[PDB]
Amino acid sequence: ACGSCRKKCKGSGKCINGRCKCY
């Protein structure tokens, strides 16, 4: 469950707690 969190964070990202944070 992320919602294109990888594209939003184009590359290595994180999608948890309903929050998409990038690395």
UniProtKB/Swiss-Prot annotation:
Annotated InterPro entries: Scorpion_toxin-like_sf
GO cellular component: extracellular region
Job description of the protein: Blocks reversibly Shaker B potassium channels. Also displaces binding of noxiustoxin to mouse brain synaptosome membranes.
Keyword Disulfide bond: yes
SUPFAM superfamilies linked to this entry: Scorpion toxin-like (SSF57095)
Tissue: Expressed by the venom gland.
Site description Basic residue of the functional dyad, residues in chain: K14
Source organism, top-level taxon: Eukaryota
Family: Belongs to the short scorpion toxin superfamily. Potassium channel inhibitor family. Alpha-KTx 13 subfamily.
Organism: Tityus obscurus (Amazonian scorpion)
Domain notes for this protein: Has the structural arrangement of an alpha-helix connected to a beta-sheet by disulfide bonds (CSalpha/beta).
Keyword annotations of the record: Disulfide bond, Ion channel impairing toxin, Neurotoxin, Potassium channel impairing toxin, Secreted, Toxin
Disulphide bond pairs: C2-C15, C5-C20, C9-C22
Chain segments carrying region Interaction with Ca(2+)-activated K(+) channels: 13-20
Gene Ontology MF: a single term: potassium channel inhibitor activity
GO biological process entries: envenomation resulting in negative regulation of voltage-gated potassium channel activity in another organism
Location(s) in or outside the cell: Secreted
Site (Aromatic residue of the functional dyad): Y23
Keyword Disulfide bond listed: yes
Name of the protein this chain belongs to: Potassium channel toxin alpha-KTx 13.1
